[PDB]
Structure formats: C-alpha cells, structure tokens
Amino acid sequence: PEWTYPRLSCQGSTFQKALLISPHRFGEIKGNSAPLIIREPFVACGPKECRHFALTHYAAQPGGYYNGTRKDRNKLRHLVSVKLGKIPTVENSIFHMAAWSGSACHDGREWTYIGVDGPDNDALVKIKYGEAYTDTYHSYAHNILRTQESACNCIGGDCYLMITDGSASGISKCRFLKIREGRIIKEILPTGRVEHTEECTCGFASNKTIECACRDNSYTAKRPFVKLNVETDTAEIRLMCTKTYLDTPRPDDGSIAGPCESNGDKWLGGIKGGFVHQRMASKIGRWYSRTMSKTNRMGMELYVRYDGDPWTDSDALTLSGVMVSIEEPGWYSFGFEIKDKKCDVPCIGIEMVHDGGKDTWHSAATAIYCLMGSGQLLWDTVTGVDMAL
Amino acid sequence: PEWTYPRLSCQGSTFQKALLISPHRFGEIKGNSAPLIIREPFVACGPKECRHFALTHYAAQPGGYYNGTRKDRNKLRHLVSVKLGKIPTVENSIFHMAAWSGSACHDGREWTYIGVDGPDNDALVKIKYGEAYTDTYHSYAHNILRTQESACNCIGGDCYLMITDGSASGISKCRFLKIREGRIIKEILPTGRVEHTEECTCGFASNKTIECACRDNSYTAKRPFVKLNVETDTAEIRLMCTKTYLDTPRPDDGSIAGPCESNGDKWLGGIKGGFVHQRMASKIGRWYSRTMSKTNRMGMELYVRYDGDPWTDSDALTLSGVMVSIEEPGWYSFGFEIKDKKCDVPCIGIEMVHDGGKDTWHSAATAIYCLMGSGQLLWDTVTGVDMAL
Amino acid sequence: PEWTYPRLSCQGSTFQKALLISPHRFGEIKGNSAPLIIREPFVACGPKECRHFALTHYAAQPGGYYNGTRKDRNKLRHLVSVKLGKIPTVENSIFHMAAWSGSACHDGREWTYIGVDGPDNDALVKIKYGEAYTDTYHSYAHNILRTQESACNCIGGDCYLMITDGSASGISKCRFLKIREGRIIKEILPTGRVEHTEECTCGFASNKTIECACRDNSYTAKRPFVKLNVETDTAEIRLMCTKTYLDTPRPDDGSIAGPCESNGDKWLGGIKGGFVHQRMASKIGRWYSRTMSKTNRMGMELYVRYDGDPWTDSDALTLSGVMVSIEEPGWYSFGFEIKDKKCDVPCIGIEMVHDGGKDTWHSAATAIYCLMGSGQLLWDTVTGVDMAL
Amino acid sequence: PEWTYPRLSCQGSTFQKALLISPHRFGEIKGNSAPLIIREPFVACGPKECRHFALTHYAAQPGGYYNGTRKDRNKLRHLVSVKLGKIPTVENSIFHMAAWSGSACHDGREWTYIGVDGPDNDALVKIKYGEAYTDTYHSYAHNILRTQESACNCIGGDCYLMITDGSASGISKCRFLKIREGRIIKEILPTGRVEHTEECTCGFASNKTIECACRDNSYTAKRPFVKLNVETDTAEIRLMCTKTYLDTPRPDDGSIAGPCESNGDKWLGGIKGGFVHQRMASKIGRWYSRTMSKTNRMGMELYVRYDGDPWTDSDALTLSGVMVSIEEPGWYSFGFEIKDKKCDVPCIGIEMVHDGGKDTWHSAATAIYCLMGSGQLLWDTVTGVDMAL
Numbered sequence A, B, C, D: 001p002e003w004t005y006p007r008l009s010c011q012g013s014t015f016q017k018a019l020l021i022s023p024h025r026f027g028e029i030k031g032n033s034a035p036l037i038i039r040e041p042f043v044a045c046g047p048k049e050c051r052h053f054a055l056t057h058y059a060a061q062p063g064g065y066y067n068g069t070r071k072d073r074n075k076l077r078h079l080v081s082v083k084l085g086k087i088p089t090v091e092n093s094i095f096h097m098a099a100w101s102g103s104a105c106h107d108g109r110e111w112t113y114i115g116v117d118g119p120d121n122d123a124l125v126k127i128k129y130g131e132a133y134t135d136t137y138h139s140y141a142h143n144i145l146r147t148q149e150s151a152c153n154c155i156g157g158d159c160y161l162m163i164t165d166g167s168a169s170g171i172s173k174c175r176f177l178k179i180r181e182g183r184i185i186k187e188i189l190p191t192g193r194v195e196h197t198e199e200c201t202c203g204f205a206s207n208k209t210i211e212c213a214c215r216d217n218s219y220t221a222k223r224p225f226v227k228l229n230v231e232t233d234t235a236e237i238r239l240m241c242t243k244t245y246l247d248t249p250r251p252d253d254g255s256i257a258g259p260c261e262s263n264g265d266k267w268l269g270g271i272k273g274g275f276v277h278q279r280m281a282s283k284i285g286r287w288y289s290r291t292m293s294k295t296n297r298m299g300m301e302l303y304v305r306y307d308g309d310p311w312t313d314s315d316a317l318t319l320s321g322v323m324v325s326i327e328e329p330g331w332y333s334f335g336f337e338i339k340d341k342k343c344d345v346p347c348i349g350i351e352m353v354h355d356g357g358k359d360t361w362h363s364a365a366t367a368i369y370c371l372m373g374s375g376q377l378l379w380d381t382v383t384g385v386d387m388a389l
C-alpha cells in the first residue's frame, strides 16, 4: 500500500444530510439490543473504509451501569469503533485500548490509534499501530494530558496529532506530535497565542499546511486557529478574527471590540467545533459548524468562507444552513474526509448527546453532513430518541 | 474489475419458490431478536453477491417506536442493506444514508446507492458511490421527488435510474438519470405518454434497450411502459396494451374499451409491480407479477409473454402461477437478476407487508421466485408471522 | 481454484470427541440469545472451511412459534448454515433457500446447495450454485421427493446426489443425480435391491466408487448399501450382510436367518445412519454408527470394519466405542471429511434431538467425532440442555 | 506464508495499561447481551491478528446454567476464541473443540489448537491444525493429563507445548511436545528438578532457548523454571533462586533458607504466573507478574530483571508497578507477544475472576499490559463488574 496525501476536494458547493447513526433508537427496555453508552464520537477514513470511533463507558442500554456515565475520565473508558454505517453495539464494536480521550487516523497502510489515560496529574498518551502498542507520551503540564477527540492527519506516512496539557480554567499550551508508524519521531512546540488550546479539529489546507480550529476554555469565545507547516514542522497560533464567533457560550456576533487579537470577556467554557476544508486549484473553502444557541449546546449551524486569512479577516462567515434545530442537541462537531476514487469529500459530524442528568444514562447520536451537489442545505437531523424508554 | 453487461438468461421456462426472508418470525416480545421495521424492500446483485436493500423507519420489533412506522416520509428513514440470505436485524444491517425513497445497483466495480430525502416540496436525490457521497439532483416539479424502490440498471459503467416528481393524484412526468461513477452525466426526458410515471421497475431487454413496467397513480389501471434506448439515450412511454391489467386496483380483464392508449376509468391509485426479462438468442420473455385481488394488495400472480410489443399487443398474458394466495399480503414486487457463471437468472421479489393499522408496527417480509428448471410453478409463500406476538 | 478429489485419509486408528454444537444451552427464557429451531443437521467441508448446515423451522428459542416444529415438511422450512464452530443463531446463519429436505457439497470452487420443497405429491429438488438458482428436478413417484440430509460428493467438478421418491411404508426406488456447476447433466438409475432406499449417507471409497449406507423404512433393519461407479456412472444396491444391523429399530444381532439378502421382519421404520471411509493405500476402513438402544433413538455406538465386501460379509463389525450413552438422544448421524493439508480426516456427526413432544419446541444439538491418533475412543457427548428452561 | 521466528523486542522500558476485556459489564439481567462464562483466558498472536482464547462452560450470563461453572473439568467445556478486542459473546465466538484444558499458537501459516479432555485417569491431548483434527497424545501418569492454559511457542514451523500428568498434591513430571503442522514429531523429557511442573508460561529467550516460569502445586512457593534447547531439543528444570517468590500462596520474601534449590515449606497450592521476555541485542529482560496478596489471588504486581540466571540469582526482582490493587481479583496471568512490523511487543495478561461461590456464575475478565514507552507504570485495572446484577 502507498501513502495517503490530501487531494483536491470533489466538486460541490453545498452540504446535505448524509447519515444519522442513532444507536439508542434501539435501547428500549422493551427492545433486544445493546447499543454502547458513548461520548466524543468522531469519524476517520482510510482509502477504503471509514470508521465511527468513540469513547465508551464500557456499558450498554438497557443496562445497570448508568451511574458515572456523565463524567468523562475513569478506568473503564475505552476507545472503540465500528465500520461507518454499523450500529455501535456490544458485539459490533472492537475495543482498541483503554482511553478517556482519543484520536485516530489512517496513514494509507495501517490504522493509528491514540488513547490517553492514567491519573489526571500524570496522564499518558499511548499509541497503537494496528495491533501493536508502539509508543507513549507523558504529561508535561501535569494537568490532564488530553488530545483531539477527532481524526489526526497523515501525509506521506507522517501523522500529526494535537495534544494539550493544563488547567481547563487557565493555561493549556498545546503541542503537536509527529508520529510515523506508531512512534513519535518529533514534538512540535507552537508559537504565538499559546495560553489555551484544546480539542483541535485539524485538516489539510494543502500539502504544506494543516489548520485547526480549536477550543479556548478560559479566555475567549473566539476559536484559536492553528497554522502548522508540514515542511518546516512549525506551528503558530492565534484567534480567528471573524465576527462570527464559533465557540459556545459566546456573545452576540461582532460583539467583541478591539483588534483581531482581543479576547473579550472570558465566557468561561467552550466546545469542540466542526471544521473541514474544500480544496480547489484556485480557492480554499473553509467550512465551520457552531451551535445555534449562544449559551447552550442546542442546534448546529453550517458556515463557509472562501479564502482570506482566518487570523486577519474580521468579516462574517456565510450562513450555509441549519443542520440541527434549536430543539435538538448540538454538542461536539468534527471534520473528516471520505476518500472517493480521485478526490476527497469533506464532511462535518455532529455529536448529539442525550442528556437527562447524572441519574440516568448519558450517550450520543452522530449526524453526518457532506459536501454534495449544489444549491442550498435542505434538511435537518433529529435523533428520534425518547430517553424515557 | 471489468464492467457489467446484461448477458443471456440461463435456460428455464418456469419460476419456483426460491427464498423467503421473514424477519418478523423473530420479533416476538418473548424472543431475543431485533429485526428492523422496514418497507419497500428490493434486491440488487453484483457479480459476486446479491443484497437485500430496504427503507427502515430506524426502529425494531420488539421496540417502542411503532408510532409513525406506517407513514412513508420522515427524518428518521434510512436505506439499509444486508447480504441476501441474512436477516435484517439491528446488527446485521449497514446504514447507507438517510432516505425515504431509494434505489441501488452494481456497475461491475462498485455499489451505487440512491436515496431521496428532504422536504416534500424540495426533496433531493443523493448519490453515493461506495463510501463517498458523490452527487445530488433536485426537485423539478416540487412535489415529492422520488425514485424506483427497485434496482437501477448499469451497462458498461453507465447506470440508468428513473426519478419522477409531481402529484400522486395528478401529473408526474418522470425523468431518467444517466449516472457514471456516482455523478450524473446526463438527464433523459422521455417522450410520449408522460402524464404519470412512478416506481418504475426496469431491466435490460437487450444491450440496446431498458424497459420498465411502471405505475400510473392518477389515470389508469394500465401500467405505463418505458422503452429507453441506451445508445441514443432517449426514452418514450406509453401504456401496456394487454387485456391483463397489472396495476391495483383495476377492473375486470379486457374491461377497458377503446384502443391501446385508452386510460379507462382513473381507478385512483396503484402499486409498484414486478417485471423482469428472460433473454434468449431468439426470443424475449417478459415476466410480470400482479396482485390476485383486483382491489386489494392480497396475493400475487405470475404472468409471462414471449415477444410482441407491450405497446400494441392487446392479448392476454399467460398465467404462470400463484406465488402468493389471496389470504396472504401482496404489496410491492420488483425484478432483479442473479449473475451466474455465464448467464443471468431473472427473479421477482414480493414485499409481504404486515399491516395491522397505524396503532402497531408496520413492516415487511420478502419472498423470492426465480427462473429455474421447467414444468409449472409448484408452491406459494406464506410469511408465517402472527402480528399479536 | 482447482477441482476437489478424494485423497488418502490422514493416519489414525481411532475416533475421539471433537466438537459439540449445543445451540440450546443458550435458549433459556432468562438468556438473551436466539438459537434457531432446527433438525436434520449435517456438516460439509470445502478445501478451506467446513459448514454446519441444517433445516430450520424459521423459528427461535425462546420464541412463540414452537407449534409445528416437530413435523418435517412445510412452507416455512429453510436450508441454513453457519461456519462450523459458530452457534446457529438468527443472526449468525445464512438462509440459502426454502427446503424441507436438503443436501450440500463443495466441488473445489463453489458451493452447491440442494433443497427439496413443494407439495408432497409433486415436490421438487432445486439446485443452487453459489448465489444462483441453476436447476431443478421433479417428483417421479409422486410421493414426497426427498434427498440425503447429508453431504453430496464431488469429484473433478462432478457431484453425485441421491434422491428418492415414494411411500415411507412401501416402495421408494432411489435415483442419483450427476450435477455439474449446478445443472443436472445426468440421472443414474440403480440396479439390484431397489424396493426402498432413502437418506443415503455417501462417501468416496476410492476415486472410482462412491458407497452409501442408506435407510430402508419398510422391509428390513438391514441397511441397503450402494456401490456407485463414477467411471461408468452406474449404481447397484443390496443389503449389508453383516450380523451387526445398523438400522433402528432392529432385532438382536445375528437374529435374521437366511442368506445376506434376507429382509427378515419388516421392523417398520428406520433412521439415517452415520458412515464414512478411511482410505489407506492398502486397506479400506469403513466406519459406521448406530443407536445404542435397538428400539429407540437413544445413544450412539461407533463400529469399524476393514476391507471385505459389505454385501457378502456376514461377520460382525467391531465395536469401536460409545459416542453417546443410552440416556442421551441419538438421532440422525452422517459422515463428512475435513480437508487437511495433504490428507482427509473422516468424521461422524450425531444429531442429538431435544424431544419433549408436540407441545413445546423441537430442535437439535450436533456432536462431532473424528479420526485422530490411536488407542481407544475416550469420552462421550452430552447435550447439557434442560428443556424446562 | 513464511514461518514465524522470535525477533528483537520493540524498545521500551515500561509496561502500561493497554486493554481491558470485561465481558460481564454486559451480563445484567436487565441488559440484552450474552457474554460466555469462561475461565483460564489467554492471548496468542499470529503475524496479523491476536486472539483471545478461553475455556467456556458452554453457558452465558444471564442464563440458567451457573451450577457447576466453578468446577474445571467436564463434558461441556470448550476452547473458544474471538479476535482480541471483541467481546466473547455467544455469537462472537468460535468453538474450536471440546477441552477442559487448552493451549494455542500460530506458526506463521496456520493456527494450532490444543485441547485436553476425557476421563481424569485417561485424559487426552488433542491437536487441531486449522480446521483439521490432526493428532492426539495420551495420559502417561494417568492423573488428569493437562497443559499450559497459555500460548505455545513456534519457531520455523516447530511448536513446543508443555504438558504434565500427575497428582496436584504430589508428583507431576512434565513433558514437552514438539509439534509440526498438527502432528507430534517429538516428545521431550526434561532433566533436573522434575517432581512437579504444571501450567508453564513459556516464551523465547532467544532463537535457541524457550524458558518457562511454571507452577509447583505440592512442594514449594518457588516457581520451577524451564530452560528448553530448541537446537538439541532437551529441557532441564530447577527452581528460580530469587528472593521474590512468585507463586501464591507464599511466605515473606527471602523467607526461605538454604541454597537456591531449597523447597521450603510446601505451601500447598499455587497459581499460573505471568512471564514474558524483552530481547535486546545486548540484554535480556525477564518480566514476571505475581499476586499482591501472599495468600489470596487478589491484586497483581509487575516485576523485572535484566540478565542473570534465574536458577542461581538469589537477588530480588525489581518492582515495576501495581497492575491490579489488592481489592480486585488477580488470578491466572500469562505472557504473549504482539508482532509489530519489525519487532515484538511483550505483554502480560491477567485473568480477573468474578468469584461469588458455587451458587452463582463464575467467569473472568482479562486485563492487558504491554511494554510501551518509558517511565513508570501509570494506572491499574478494575473489572467494574457488580456480580449482583
């Protein structure tokens, strides 16, 4: 097998409803199924198959282990996966490794799986290449070492993964692991606005740069934007200048005064946001997704912007459609690309969490929208699940 | 892999009971299975495997989501599939895409999947090639854009699919998409009797023509018959002249006065009908299926006719056997062909719907009859399912 | 792929307990499984995989369709299969075709499946080659056309299958279909003692002959023995002369007076019996299995005999071991051969039916014994299933 | 395919938590799953896939066959397996053969499966190569012939397996079968301290020697250590001299007086212990695991020792970490190696038995730790299962 490289996107000018994976439409006390309790789903694709990954609490619905399924880190959590299209049940899934934070990507020949686990003050990034545990990385800030919760990106056998370490309420300077065949051959230290960068959604803007729309949990509702050079292996970060803030919670659009680099009010918190590229010979399409509600993880909107510099462009992004309405859950979103015969199809996935509190199960559905054809985005996604059943 | 082309049918002069897929013989409240609630099943075959496709309501039996499973369009519906022979349960199936109307065919190298979804007045045909969403088509009449609910037909890498748009009670002029590797390379506008044509069952009459027995829902109990030229890429439609009307409901045979083109009384309504070819060097066998009851979807009969012109032949078709008796359900029927080592085996499938009203689940069984050996058709198919369990 | 031919057996001088497939150890009302209700199991092997075939009543345990699962012929029955080693549940199995009598064999390139179905007075043998229905054969005596319920045997692409037609209480002259790539290229009419021959268990005695130990249901407790010539394509039948009668019920051993050809008392009834060959350069080992109880299908014994002529040898067979004790069920038995790297391993399977009457489910377990190593047969098989659960 | 040979271990200096397979986190009376009741799990890897083997009591949870699932030998037990990562449910697993003691290994081309079964005083080792039963071996001491309960080791197509026969409370002289393509081509009689050696965990110390840390059930808390020469095909056994006794129960470390060969008090009993190698060009790392509690199978500790002679080195092993705390079960442990692209990854598995007495089910979880990266062992494994559900 030969190495994967980003190619031109397939042509299209709009995203449409592609696929909904609602595992819990089969979790009734009356039904006879075993969908796993999961969270932080993401899709990664190899040249031949796409895979629906997720972090399971090692429990099913119906079941008797709902207690604690709303908390994120523990000794039971595992990175699991199914072929995209398959329902993630107890028997359908493959357990890759113990992890309460993960990532995965296909280098063209084999699958690389990233799972972080261990004690908060000394967590560990573990790397698996296919069936073999090949390497690990240690906590540097000693405050919950974590990773992307979305696909890593490989080019010519070299895969780049964002990791971060630090306080959720303070400073978390991220790093980038350059992995090759399962072993870390390099650690990239980004430059610029480094005070807080987590849950980066990365993709190839070209064969020279990898860009990530990330999450700042302590200082702003603006998403830190990473420009990583795959030739010089150097990264530099700074805020997306756009009026259309993509974090949640956030203030009114255009609400933040000052130059591009202004944080504005902290707006304590954030969320992982969808972001994927549309590469054309002439232009670059940057697709973003963000919650409909400014304060809550309800709904999901699609935005596009062709060309410009995310760092210096104060202009608003263009609304491209409602993927999820305000009455449906809109939690984490990510980007991924399906590999078609000659070109790449960009897609955005939306984690639709079923929240009913700490005193009941807590799992998620995954909605998929991909670039296809033209015109306007036509329909939205509902999970269809009734938590009382 | 090299492209698929229609070949001569394998020899035989009769159809026999081949296979019954009754998923709900395992849906008892007492059992431990999860058969999906489906409707509009159809079978399509590649050079190596056949597949049982269907439109699921994203629900199982036993389960708690039976409400609404009798209606056809919604945001939960999906085109799913299993290898033919497998029971379509929650774990066995693969979810291809969101669709409340579909179609699928194998071009010799890859699977093409068609799923239509979106709002009634602006629905959308979406095309998937293997794992990639490759193209889409828009509503032209702005009244529920829909498709076949049966296999599309490929020849040399070119696949033809019938789509229609319009009122069920009025005019619905159908169109034909010429698809290649997932992208629409052409849109064919048929000539002739174009006022209403839906749910076309198409097949190859030869390497030059594709014929479809279709459904007219507003004006007649006679089935519109399409003759599509694969070399000039032009279609022309007009009513089957035969005395033996194949739609449901319909009047007594021979009941309609006038020339071949007479509609007769509207007989509001219709049904998708089975139709498949038997190609011989010398002759063409055209196999049709139609409900036993004239007014209700109960029972299913097999009919044959060798040669002639469906458009100008007023003669009765020859009764070839009772596949389903009047006491068993006989809903949609379709044609498909299994690819044997040197020749093609024509088959007719019958959707056997379990109807018990809107206040209980609504799913279907699929009976298969294929050309094999000679003599007369020997036995019928019962679903064996008791809806009370 | 190149054609299969019988090779020399692997060396050994004894059979040992190999594998037990007890699907109903998982059918408790308390459990969460769906083992299929089956009967008439048999194993057939290709060059690479063996398969556990059976005739399902299209029902599971626990379930609500036990009524009628004790009767043998109906419109719901199907020939199904799983990889040998897999439990035959609703999801594990593949439904091949509708059949209330079957057979199957691998010709070295593809699977051939035989299923007989239709009305008793006009049943039909249907042949499937891989995915394609390729041919059929008709009732000649017009009294339940049936077949082997065990593997057919292929040599150089030619597969021989025994079929029989007629009364169970009278005459049933069997025939032999020579099948090639799914189509009957010849019908062999046996010579000799032809009055009653059913459920023949056949195997290769060499590359020239196929021998079957069969069942006479009307006239004797002696098993009709078939010697079929694969070069001249002619068969001839006559009773096994041995003192050790292998049918059930039967009288005391040596009980029947007269020459080899004497029927003795009718002993109305019979059973399919295990029979497999052990080919050595110098000698031929013939392995037989028969119930421990003379009148009931309880227990199973193993017998061997090297060389001689089954037709003229009045000598007793040698007891080789108790595979099943008198307190466990011992119903149908068959032979099959696993293909090892250079040689063939002969095995005998025993259908262990769970009978509790007509007012509860009726299914079976399958025990496997194969030639391996030397010494004496060491342990027996119990199903372990409690029918009350 | 070409034969497997041991290669250099991948680099690393520590073990980390890799994967937990807790099948019973899905066995609730409320859930809808069927995890098998198992014991004596072990992992073996081929060049491309690893497999989770185990000895099932042919029963599931929830189910109604818990009675007797705490005893080890019977006619229902079977050696089963799933791909490592898959949950061992009724449908996921493959039943290889009837065995109440087993072993398995991949020679580079095919799977070899060892299962011992039969009556205690005349048990039998049966060998299966892929699908074929190829050979068997007999009881020599006529007291429960048994084997490893962990992977056998192949080199150049030759696989070595330890078997033992004898009293658990007295003498059990072990033997070593040299197997090739399923048939025993040689029986090795070890020299030295031969009075009691069972459940040997073996691995390749190099291409010349296979070393096993084994179990002495009658005379000491010191583990018998086997040095087997693959070139001369001779074995020799004697006690590990180390202060750090690895059996359970055992006295305080350094507690046993006398020279390396002193037994000390019998400390009636024992346990299978984990042991795997870390081959470097220059040095050999020997990894051992042993229960945390001296008297009970609670907890599991990791120990290492580079170079030296296990037979003459009285020094303590180095504590390398707590894999399981004293409050969690720590039963059998074994070693295995995943084959990475160029090197081998050593791992230790821990069987975590769910014991609640004889009056409820008795099954196990399997925790995996593998060499990866450096630093110290970071986290422990909990099963997470509540036996009351």
Ligand SMILES: CCC(CC)Nc1cc(C(=O)O)ccc1N1C(=O)CC[C@@]1(CN)CO
Binding pocket: A040, A055, A072, A073, A100, A101, A102, A144, A146, A147, A149, A168, A198, A199, A217, A270, A271
């Ligand atoms: C901003 C990072 C915070 C705090 C550290 N982590 C976090 C937040 C959320 C959420 O719902 O916002 C879900 C999961 C996590 N996660 C954790 O708590 C550990 C890693 C993981 C992802 N960051 C995944 O479980």
Ligand SMILES: CCC(CC)Nc1cc(C(=O)O)ccc1N1C(=O)CC[C@@]1(CN)CO
Binding pocket: B040, B055, B072, B073, B100, B101, B102, B144, B146, B147, B149, B168, B198, B199, B217, B270, B271
């Ligand atoms: C004559 C077409 C009508 C009305 C538009 N559609 C329709 C009818 C029936 C039926 O039972 O007759 C089932 C499904 C549909 N379908 C729909 O309602 C949308 C497309 C689909 C097939 N035509 C499949 O769901």
Ligand SMILES: CCC(CC)Nc1cc(C(=O)O)ccc1N1C(=O)CC[C@@]1(CN)CO
Binding pocket: C040, C055, C072, C073, C100, C101, C102, C144, C146, C147, C149, C168, C198, C199, C217, C270, C271
């Ligand atoms: C001696 C043949 C008899 C009577 C015709 N058939 C028969 C007998 C038994 C039995 O338990 O003995 C089981 C199945 C059948 N079978 C049938 O009733 C139809 C074919 C099949 C096998 N002979 C399999 O279902």
Ligand SMILES: CCC(CC)Nc1cc(C(=O)O)ccc1N1C(=O)CC[C@@]1(CN)CO
Binding pocket: D040, D055, D072, D073, D100, D101, D102, D144, D146, D147, D149, D168, D198, D199, D217, D270, D271
């Ligand atoms: C020290 C060997 C003893 C006594 C013979 N056997 C034994 C002990 C234990 C245990 O929990 O210690 C489990 C299983 C067995 N086993 C048996 O009883 C038969 C073989 C097998 C492994 N030795 C596996 O079932």
